[PDB]
Design a protein around this ligand. Structure first.
Ligand SMILES: O=C(O)/C=C/C(=O)O
Ligand SMILES: O=C(O)/C=C/C(=O)O
Ligand SMILES: O=C(O)/C=C/C(=O)O
Ligand SMILES: O=C(O)/C=C/C(=O)O
Ligand SMILES: [Cl-]
Ligand SMILES: [Cl-]
Ligand SMILES: [Cl-]
Ligand SMILES: [Cl-]
Ligand SMILES: [Cl-]
Ligand SMILES: [Cl-]
Ligand SMILES: [Cl-]
Ligand SMILES: [Cl-]
Ligand SMILES: [Mg+2]
Ligand SMILES: [Mg+2]
Ligand SMILES: [Mg+2]
Ligand SMILES: [Mg+2]
Lengths: 401, 401, 401, 401
């Protein structure tokens, strides 16, 4: 019949956060999967999906843009954010199911592949070993460990690494994340302490990385334009692949970029061409980060095309489980204007239990798989062996505090 | 202690949709309430509130902007929409509790009152009698009933009424709501049928209203700029108080307004100064609709001040239960630049059972109450006597179809 | 009755200028106070207050935004400047009275507090010891005294200091203030003499401050854009917390900022969102100075919210008596987007006689008090023991000349 | 010596407001005069003048731009409004004294005259006979009196008349002045009642004026852009010389003008090229009103030149005593780009007692005099025979209410 018979959500432990999944089944017995997240400031996504999936039952699994169009209509007033994440999660499950029904990898729905491998950067490096050492080891607790982590990246043939903001000289090593309320300093002022610690951290990372490995710096939402300018001027003499700055002020981000000696990336939290547009019109970015897990991969192809017309390359936002990596792999396979792909190389001890297939890296690149659908399936029995905790993510840093 | 002890949500039947409430209790035994909605495209608000309220327990009930600032940080990546609605619902409960603790009406927290009564328009008139006749009577099923409803508004001393788009000459009277997927025609084209039915409907309404009662026309998201221009040109010779058009294109809405012989209102679905700004910068509106139930009343005071600087008057979005009306009443009491206040005069048969106090109207104006807090409390026993159904609102029109 | 019974003004000696106060009494016997200034280019404020306060008698003390709205109407043609200062002074007295009536600190009217302490900078350092040595000692008369003053700031645990422009190598140490007619050189040209003396002064200050204490430079209105650029280029290699430039040309200030290696602050002389707007639209500032003594604290909350939407942090303008400090303390307690708070640490020998309570500093921060109202009351008997002189401020530098 | 020996202010009764004067005496015994106003929203001007005139004593009477430059410096922070009115009043007294010293009319200081007579409009017609009937008769209390007043204007050979907003069909004839708080309706909404009364009033005026006399409509600050558009659309079919709209939103006024079938005038409350600039840049006006009594005539020549470069004609703001008329006459004599000159033809019973010379009109034009100075002197004995009342103007309408 090609009809969708069911849309369900599943959830499992990922240590300091949960993983979430959409499971969609068709009349033919094909199962399409996606992975989504609630911990990155996104409570409610499951509820959105539960409501919207009810309308999908009985509809064609082939008609994903029909479903998008209908869902957009039905949630038009509160579009964006958690609503749009729910829609994107369902879209990604539909795509998997459609590809499987046609016996092709998902990239065959996206224009075909135009590359077989994708260069990555090792993300949250050493951020995960500092911030979640119970889950990702070896723990990093000082500048020497920062250096050693970059050395490890170099030895393992990764070509780039991304770090965040850390305070080394004021007690135990800790993250500076005021944009996410740790500490609670909502003006997000940047002082000498921040600047000297950024310098110390990046000098140690560079010492370990050597001169060839690229260093990316993510500042997230942790400053105002004033403070971002102060950081960029302080770090004017560093060799940075990019400086990543999230902002809801296209004019403010553009001002910062105009005064930056480094490439600027942004946009990981934005939805649709509509939200990216003011930033591109303002010349706000060198690189656009596209969260295809949030937007849905089909919507993300639209965003990538829009970026392409502005001669802006895009990078997928990818810092979740293996299924997200494979989802993003298919996007990266198909998009001409691809800057690079993010991935976390630090993995949970039980990561590989949760999925049928693990991503394969060789010489700093991700190998794009050629199996029907995204390239990996969550394993239901394994999900149930790792029951979820309460919401973590941005909420559990604040508990740890 | 002034500490928040608990944050709970409650839900009850409102016929074709549910009402939702936040109940916040302090160490002193004061209860603060707000009302929120999920049916207007907003699945997930309860989940957001459930997560965010956990951080609030143990904090001061007096420190509402502290809570806002923290909540904004913790949900920064997925801000807007359902996330921001959850934050606004909690804010409105905090304000009620704070006002009650200080033994003052909520307007005493908002600058004091500057008016004792507020002119209203009778909203969803005759929209509710056409679309939800099981709940709001007498049913309207033809042009004569449209006329009689406007006559009723005139007799009852209401000074203004707002209608939507209706098709009269193609079978049983029915709403034209393609922007919300009834019918599913996602291009939102406007054809002759739409235009001739708009004319027929508005002529009947004017016939009943007489020459003094004002007529507002809400087009919601039911067209593209092309179609909005076609409607405005068709209706160029009508006397309309305003034409309401929701748009996520500030440049497109500005173009439409620039070519409109009628005042244009918009913005009911927007959050924060940040989202209103591009519309004001573009000269997109005569009147800004502010949903204080969504934004929170404190955030809405910021939006009203911003509008004031642009010499734009604001109107509260108010089409829910009595508590929402009283919340909006307090906002309307305090804001200098107030255009008018929306209210639904068609009420559910059990509406007054659900709340301690009902809004009082005299000569087309709402009387602003002077009780501590918002002016009415939901009644827990009554809530439980009217158990909720599954989500309705935008989802149940589509079931009816 | 909650009625205002009287509005009076009081004035006392502050050495080289006077302090002024509004005293407002309610039917319940509550007294609300504010402090205002005439010496900073503002003759006439008392007269404005005397006229406007007459309309306030008999009105509710609770209805401050009503009074603002009415006063704005009654003075609409000549709004801004001295008129708006009079309105702001009355507003601040109303707020004190309202808070006292409700038995809460003023920050409880402003959203609640979100911080308990506020970092300050020591303003007019060493400006007051150079320019008014009869009142603030030890006198500073050379570069060594400049250095020692910065050392003192460091020892006393202040984290930042702000200086102005001084000429050291052309006779006795003297201020360069052509924007305020000392000397009378109304083109405000910047020559080599200015630049070399700025360098000499700042080098001495840095020598004393050490590397951790931040140095702010206030240039007031003492140049044209051409000259501001010359100063910024000369000082490109200094570590400056900000460079403060007052301008009535948003396009000119924006040009200067665009070419500045230092953060730029401005706006201390502006009134309302309306006046700040062209500067924010032009990307003219890193930091917005808000004079809440001038604007009124309620109006200033509107300005702070507007700034917040542009991701601009604000700093209160605070260089008067203890009551102004406490007024600003309450604003600083409540505003999320707070850059820093100005305060003068050099005090008059009789300062503490004039007020019931003095501000308390610890480790470079101001402690926010928790008494009803602003936190300090002027003492009538003490005011009368220090009778005012003729207007000083900007007028008495010109006498000294 | 050419030194200024004294600067004094004088004040006398003008019925519902006071007239104010600056009297400046030189070492040679020459007396220079100006007239200023406090009642049009401007409490404090006398205090400004009292302070600033102290610096002028001992300076050259010839050096008026020196004094301006110095005064601007000394009041830079609170410039505009009442401060700038005080400066302008002194400037106008300096000009009179300088012209008298050189034995020439003031226009000889302003480029020489380029016309001998100036067409006027009869302002506040029938506004003064409606609003201040105790002082200006015959009283106007109905539409017939409105018609008769326009007939009188026609018979007396005036070519144009200006009215304001009046309500005829809701009790005794009364002014609609919500922008000045009568009534207190600070949203400034425009409803049907306003529109139908505007129509009725203007139809009666046109009936009396006949087809040749021009009708100007002044809306002051009595609406928001939304409401101004509603008025202009309602009155689209009237023949109006201009519609006058005061606004502090150059973008809002520009929007209104862009949609106006009538010429738009504005700017009467603005100071300096700096304040006019955003309006001219925005294409906000057909005609710029320049208040030379406020700005000073020398500053106003700068404003007129600026307007000239934009091909905008200017009109003086002139609705005070005979000295203001003569001040404006000299400006009008000299400015090429002169639209028309305002004047009040309704005079107080004692007007001519207060001044040495009265303005002379012939065939709808003002004859420019050729006496040294402005053309008339206030008479000290007469001033003292008409002692002032408390401040009236905008404050006394509110008493009458
Ligand atoms: O994903 C990041 O780059 C940072 C996350 C955080 O600070 O929570
Ligand atoms: O609230 C309205 O105006 C329309 C709602 C709808 O068509 O669903
Ligand atoms: O307050 C200041 O920064 C400077 C004042 C002055 O030079 O008069
Ligand atoms: O001068 C006018 O045109 C109006 C003045 C007023 O309404 O007070
Ligand atoms: Cl989580
Ligand atoms: Cl902070
Ligand atoms: Cl619902
Ligand atoms: Cl369609
Ligand atoms: Cl002073
Ligand atoms: Cl000079
Ligand atoms: Cl007066
Ligand atoms: Cl109003
Ligand atoms: Mg990032
Ligand atoms: Mg609407
Ligand atoms: Mg300053
Ligand atoms: Mg006028």
């Amino acid at each position: 019949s090609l009809k969708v018979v069911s849309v369900d959500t599943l959830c499992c432990d990922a240590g300091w956060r949960n993983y979430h999944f959409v499971k969609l089944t068709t009349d033919e017995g094909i199962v399409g999967w996606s992975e989504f997240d609630e911990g990155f400031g996104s409570p409610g996504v499951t509820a959105v999906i539960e409501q919207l999936g009810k309308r999908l039952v009985g509809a064609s699994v082939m008609e994903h843009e029909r479903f998008f169009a209908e869902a957009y209509c039905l949630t038009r007033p509160a579009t964006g954010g958690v609503v749009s994440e729910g829609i994107g999660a369902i879209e990604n499950a539909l795509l998997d199911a459609k590809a499987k029904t046609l016996n092709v990898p998902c990239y065959e729905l996206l224009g075909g592949k135009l590359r077989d491998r994708v260069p990555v950067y090792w993300s949250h490096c050493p951020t995960w070993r500092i911030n979640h050492p119970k889950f990702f080891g070896p723990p990093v607790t000082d500048l020497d460990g920062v250096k050693r982590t970059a050395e490890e990246a170099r030895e393992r043939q990764f070509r780039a690494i991304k770090t965040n903001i850390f305070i080394h000289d004021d007690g135990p090593l800790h993250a500076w994340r005021p944009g996410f309320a740790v500490p609670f300093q909502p003006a997000l002022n940047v002082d000498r302490k921040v600047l000297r610690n950024l310098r110390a951290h990046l000098e140690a990372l560079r010492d370990g990385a050597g001169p060839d490995v690229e260093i990316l710096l993510d500042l997230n939402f942790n400053a105002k334009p004033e403070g971002y300018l102060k950081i960029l001027r302080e770090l004017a003499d560093f060799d940075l692949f990019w400086v990543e700055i999230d902002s809801y002020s296209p004019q403010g981000l553009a001002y910062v970029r105009n005064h930056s000696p480094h490439p600027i990336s942004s946009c990981e939290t934005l939805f649709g061409i509509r939200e990216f547009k003011p930033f591109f019109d303002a010349n706000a970015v060198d690189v656009a980060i596209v969260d295809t897990i949030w937007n849905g991969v089909w919507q993300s192809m639209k965003i990538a095309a829009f970026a392409d017309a502005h001669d802006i390359n895009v990078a997928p936002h990818n810092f979740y489980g293996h299924l997200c990596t494979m989802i993003n792999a298919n996007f990266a396979a198909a998009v001409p204007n691809l800057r690079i792909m993010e991935t976390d190389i630090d993995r949970l001890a039980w990561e590989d239990e949760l999925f049928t297939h693990a991503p394969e890296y060789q010489n700093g690149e991700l190998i794009i798989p050629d199996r029907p659908g995204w390239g990996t399936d969550p394993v239901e029995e394994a999900i149930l062996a790792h029951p979820p905790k309460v919401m973590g993510g941005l909420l559990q840093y604040k508990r740890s505090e």
